[PDB]
């Protein structure tokens, strides 16, 4: 008995035992802990090379247990009914807090209690950066460790006082320390190694804003190209249906095919095959979403529509044509601005982004400064038709509108199919 | 439609970058009324609770600060008693009689 | 491995079906083979050599063996840059020098590796002497017209030759189908 | 378009193989101002880098 | 051995600097606690001006 | 084995089509069978039998 050592369970009696859910899942002691909680059966771990052990009598538990863990750690733990039966209180932290003067005051007080010297400008800049991390104009990031880390860096760069310039310099340094990938991309674009088009108009080609692989997901434009051929009603995504992906539709090809087959009907089937391509292998396209850029590129390819290359197109669409919100809108817009500014702004560049992301547009000082001077534009579209109108610069319905040109292109492809069938007949 | 600068401006204007401000400490779990109330219920009732939230929210920091301000009677001295050479049981004695 | 398209088959097929449209379907099947396989080409790289070879096979265009073509291309026709271009250019120059420079050999590379062109002294001396040629191409059309030694300007151009070859193969298929039917 | 030799020439012209040069040693992390600044911040702030 | 010595937790007064190739951290950055602890990324560009 | 004609049936069809020309196609279905099942016919080429 004298060689029995206490664990966490034996020294939390009459108090609180705080564990980590991730630790319980990782170390494989969740079952033993469960049995300790329900049956009061806590017993010291016995080495398998000992000849005899000690039959520890079951111990009634007077402690209460508080697990701590991220939602992903508990979704793998809530599955068994015993967790729901035992842990009945869910203290859930919201990832975002309301962005309001009361919360600005609370954050300032919290940072002052953490041991920083703040000014009004520094606190306001930290508050706006909290919004920016939350990627919402009405919610601030509740992750106060991330805000404390930023404040610590700002204190180091400012010598101890967190002025607005100090926090802005800290934010710029944080952006720049992981800017190597974007620096490489801009250098390649300037050298012409990676060729993009931020000026003029082109057919079947549009700058689709995508995100790259990094801890700070960096946005950048990619030359998305759609090319239309006469054939069966079948859309092919070479990046998504590469190789073994031929069987599997990823719900993105089906969405675009559904929109195209349902919207344009003068023929009993879609008489075109659309090929969608992304330059190089940095795009890493998610299958589950069908981009608005893909749809407008396909429409331009079908209808021979010169789309503006000034405007990068981002956003997801469903088969109705309604433009869906996309994540990381800030990264995409700022990446396109970086590419345009490297090549030199002309005054007509811009981004077509969903109206649903209007609430998520928290942009750096430079983008808003360009918007002030009119050297950069942000277009909010609610339907893919509006995005196509903005890219091609004309109404869909009118005199020689885009709809008529799309009908003409589909009719031409159908007549080519008819000619092929007539050739096969004879 | 083309978004104007006025619609895109999301930053609160800075009154001044000087004149350092002094502010009162916020209450525990500021802006986290749900977590605060769940913990109030858990400690008041003695239920086993679990805190869920994105990492780096300082979930551990508030939780320890909240529990440190809590008060309950002195935990009894628990100790292992040998019922035999092989049988040992966890026996709880009142405070100070160990 | 024929089930996996490696993303290169689909790219070339889309470019061929899109750039040349005179039929409801593409009636041609292209087989690409490497004699003395020592290549191990990247799956995701759709080389410009493959595209120009397939295009010449379709159109019966005599390509010059003097000039080398390399680099990846998309299904639009704008040629993408490739890494280790210096090694490839120097290897082709070494092969030409071992076989003897003819004064008309050269290398065709994308106009995206000019910032990546860093060669040896011997290659630069050969270029200065005018016995070796460097050709920068932005689109597969430029590489094609340089490699075939003829432009699209005027009669007997390459585009009409491609259309004629496609029409001839389509008529071959039509005759086969007619014989099968009757 | 056949490109001139001048556009292919990239080596800076050599002036002489004699007179060995004597230049002051550079500060550490030359040309890597990002890495140097990040390490300066880490050292001054005590962060793990 | 039967058991060691229960070393009490010790406050860390040291600064850790990891060194590795980007491929070494791409397999290590996936864990959130890495970003939580190591917040300074001193990245060496593969090429200099 | 139903998939792929194995180029052995094709030889028989080609001979029948070329030697007797009255149509573009083959106007008959020839069912070739072996009594019992120990034959294990090699698919390299069509047999004279």
Describe the structure.
- The structure is cut from a larger assembly and holds 6 copies of chain A.
- Chain A is an alpha/beta fold.
- Chain A has 2 domains: 100-177, no CATH class; 178-419, no CATH class.
- The first copy, chain A, contains 16 helices and 20 strands.
- The first copy, chain A, has helices spanning 8-11, 21-27, 30-39, 71-75, 81-86, 101-114, 120-134, 144-158, 164-177, 180-191, 252-263, 292-303, 329-343, 365-373, 384-392, 402-425; strands at 16-20, 55-56, 64-69, 89-92, 96-98, 117-118, 139-141, 161-162, 201-203, 205-211, 219-230, 234-237, 272-277, 290-291, 306-308, 311-313, 316-317, 323-324, 350-354, 377-381.
- Chain A has a 4-stranded mixed sheet. Chain A has a 3-stranded antiparallel sheet with strand order 14-17-18.
- Chain A is globular, with a radius of gyration of 29 Å.
- Chains in contact: A-B, A-C, A-D, A-E, B-E, C-D, C-F, D-E.
- The interface between A and E is medium-sized, with 12 and 14 residues.
- β3 of chain A pairs parallel with β1 (49-52) of chain B.
């Amino acid at each position: 008995v004298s060689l029995i050592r206490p664990g966490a369970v034996h020294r939390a009696q009459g108090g609180y035992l705080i564990l980590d859910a991730l630790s319980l899942k990782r170390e494989g002691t969740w079952e033993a802990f469960k049995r300790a909680l329900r049956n009061g059966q806590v017993e010291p771990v016995t080495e398998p090379q000992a000849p005899a052990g000690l039959e520890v009598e079951p111990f009634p538990i007077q402690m209460q247990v508080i697990l701590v863990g991220t939602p992903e750690a508990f979704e793998g733990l809530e599955e068994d009914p015993a967790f729901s039966e035992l842990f009945r209180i869910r203290a859930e932290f919201s990832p975002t807090l309301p962005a309001s003067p009361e919360n600005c005051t609370a954050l300032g007080g919290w940072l002052l209690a953490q041991g920083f010297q703040l000014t009004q400008g520094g606190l306001t800049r930290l508050y706006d950066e909290a919004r920016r991390m939350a990627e919402q104009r009405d919610r601030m990031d509740a992750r106060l460790v991330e805000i404390r880390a930023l404040a610590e860096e700002a204190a180091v760069l400012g010598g101890g006082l967190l002025t607005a310039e100090s926090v802005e310099q800290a934010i710029a340094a944080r952006e720049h320390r992981s800017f190597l990938s974007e620096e490489e991309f801009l250098r390649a674009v300037q050298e012409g190694v990676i060729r993009l088009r931020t000026t003029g108009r082109a057919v079947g080609e549009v700058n689709s804003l995508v995100v790259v692989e990094a801890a700070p997901y960096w946005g950048r434009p990619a030359r998305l190209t759609a090319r239309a051929a006469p054939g069966r009603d079948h859309l092919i995504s070479i990046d998504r249906e590469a190789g073994l992906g031929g069987q599997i539709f990823h719900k993105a090809v089906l969405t675009l095919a559904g929109y195209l087959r349902s919207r344009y009907i003068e023929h009993g089937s879609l008489p075109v095959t659309i090929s969608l391509a992304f330059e190089q292998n940095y795009v890493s396209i998610e299958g589950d979403a069908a981009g608005l850029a893909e749809l407008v590129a396909a429409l331009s390819a079908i209808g021979n529509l010169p789309l503006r290359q000034d405007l990068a197109v981002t956003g997801a669409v469903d088969q109705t044509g309604k433009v869906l919100a996309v994540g990381a809108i800030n990264a995409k817009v700022e990446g396109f601005f970086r590419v345009c500014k490297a090549l030199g702004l002309s005054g007509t560049q811009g981004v077509i982004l969903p109206e649903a992301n209007l609430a998520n547009l928290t942009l750096r000082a430079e983008v808003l400064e360009a918007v002030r001077a009119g050297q950069f534009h942000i277009y909010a579209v609610e339907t893919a038709e509006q995005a196509l109108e903005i890219l091609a610069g004309a109404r869909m319905e009118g005199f020689r509108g885009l709809q008529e040109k799309i009908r003409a292109g589909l009719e031409a492809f159908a007549r080519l199919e008819e000619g092929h069938d007539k050739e096969d007949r004879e | 439609m083309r978004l104007s600068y006025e619609a895109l401006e999301w930053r609160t204007p800075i009154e001044n970058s000087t004149e350092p401000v002094s502010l009162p400490p916020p209450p525990p779990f500021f802006g986290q009324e749900r977590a605060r109330e769940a913990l109030e219920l858990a400690i008041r009732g003695g239920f086993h609770a679990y805190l869920v939230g994105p990492p780096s929210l300082g979930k551990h920091e508030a939780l320890l600060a909240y529990l440190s301000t809590q008060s309950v009677e002195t935990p009894p001295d628990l100790l292992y008693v040998p019922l035999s050479e092989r049988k040992v049981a966890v026996l709880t004695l009142p405070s100070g009689q160990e």
